[PDB]
């Protein structure tokens, strides 16, 4: 540390280096609930989490109960230990509440005043955050597994919806259009994800074992089908020997991660679909529904956090190296989300907990001359062989 501080003060190293090094060290030090609980509002499993992109203060949660909960993550108490309290909820008393489990919540990418929700009740809903009233509602023939709004598109406001139907659907919130379908897939579409680099490029994953990249401006059909063997454009390509149930672009958009029920994670070049041949080993993935997982941002290494049964596995994206297993939950983890500002990970599970994983690099320090106001050696940490 003191070396980094000296090098920064003297301009020997760019201020980038201390910042990225310490961010990486913090990710390596994640510990369960060290400073922080999250308030138990849900009665069911936590299907989905989304941290607000503007300030990172607020987290939406959706669950198998159909409830949507909005949490405040900032410690506005003066204590070193605190609870992330629920600001407000769309509970079962609300008229517009979802009838069946809520499978994706996403903030509007450009300000916090609106958010979107989807559910196995075959709806996509648009919510006014200040009032928690729906502004628009879209209905579908089939249960929605996933939806996404483009994180970078200013030009268009399209929601991609993946359903049990074989056709991807696109809803235009500006016009209210929901007629536009993409017709290339053959089974249920389990994950959809817009490129963070390009306004118009949508990745889609399906139980047909295919990941397809689309340019939604075109009348032409899809661009690229990912072939895990690298050899041919559509006739037989598969990304996994199983269902493909999760997508995550890397934070630069240059690669796409995919996870599937073959228990493998695979890294792809997003500009042409080449399998980069990074091998992570067995990544346990039994999930028959979409799996949400996340990369880090702003670290010296790009990490990926992936549900691994009841654990969260951490890998280095490019090296394939398994770094740690975060070992908290009692049932399968369904989502995790990364707070980029402070390198804190939140995780939802079918055990109904939301758990915070927080960098725990060192303890509060005593003064040895104190009587009892020290940083206490609690007797729970003591042996008792007598």
């Amino acid at each position: 540390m003191l070396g980094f501080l000296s090098a920064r003060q003297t301009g020997l190293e760019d201020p980038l280096r201390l910042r990225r090094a310490e961010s990486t060290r913090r990710v390596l030090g994640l510990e369960l609930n060290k400073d922080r609980d999250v308030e138990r509002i849900h009665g069911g499993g936590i299907n989905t989490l989304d941290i607000e992109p503007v300030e990172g203060r607020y987290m939406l949660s959706g669950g198998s109960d159909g409830v949507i909960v909005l949490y405040d993550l900032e410690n506005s108490s003066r204590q070193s230990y605190y609870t992330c309290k629920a600001v407000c909820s769309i509970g079962r008393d609300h008229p517009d509440v979802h009838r069946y489990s809520v499978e994706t919540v996403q903030w509007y990418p450009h300000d916090t005043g609106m958010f979107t929700s989807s559910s196995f009740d075959k709806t996509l809903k648009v919510w006014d955050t200040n009032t928690l009233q729906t502004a628009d509602v879209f209905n579908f023939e089939e249960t929605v597994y996933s939806h996404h709004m483009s994180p970078v598109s200013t030009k268009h406001c399209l929601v991609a919806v993946g359903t049990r139907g074989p056709k991807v659907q696109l809803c235009d919130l500006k016009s209210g259009s929901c007629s536009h379908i993409l017709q290339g897939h053959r089974q249920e579409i389990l994950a959809v994800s817009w490129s963070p680099r390009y306004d118009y490029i949508l990745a889609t994953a399906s139980a047909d074992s295919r990941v397809k990249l689309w340019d939604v401006r075109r009348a032409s059909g899809c661009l690229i089908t990912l072939d895990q063997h690298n050899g041919a454009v559509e006739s037989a390509n598969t990304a996994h020997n199983g269902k493909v149930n999760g997508l995550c672009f890397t934070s630069d958009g240059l690669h796409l991660l995919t996870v599937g029920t073959d228990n493998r994670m695979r890294l792809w070049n997003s500009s042409n679909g080449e399998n980069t041949l990074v091998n992570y080993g067995k990544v346990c993935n039994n999930s028959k529904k979409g799996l949400k997982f996340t990369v880090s941002c702003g670290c010296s290494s790009e990490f990926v956090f992936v549900p691994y049964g009841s654990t969260i596995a951490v890998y280095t994206v490019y090296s394939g190296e398994q770094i740690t297993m975060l070992k908290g939950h009692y049932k399968t983890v369904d989502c995790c989300v990364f707070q980029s500002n402070f390198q804190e990970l939140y995780s939802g599970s079918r055990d109904c907990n939301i758990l915070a994983w927080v960098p725990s690099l060192y303890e509060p320090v005593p003064d040895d001359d104190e009587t009892t106001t020290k940083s206490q050696l609690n007797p729970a940490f003591e042996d008792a062989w007598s």
């Binding site: 074989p166 056709k167 053959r186 089974q187």
Partner: protein, 50 residues
């Protein structure tokens, strides 16, 4: 859509089937208008009158 083409191949299969045998156990009879069943090639060949 895959389920439409599945249902259409299923219907083609049913018609090619009822051309040879219109006395299948677990499927509806092929019929003319006014509802009379069609005579298949099997019923042409089968019985004492066949």
């Amino acid at each position: 859509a895959a389920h439409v083409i599945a249902e259409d191949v299923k219907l083609l299969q049913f018609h090619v089937a009822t051309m040879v045998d219109n006395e299948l156990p677990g499927l509806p009879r092929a019929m003319q208008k006014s509802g009379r069943p069609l005579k298949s090639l099997k019923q042409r060949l089968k019985g004492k009158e066949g």
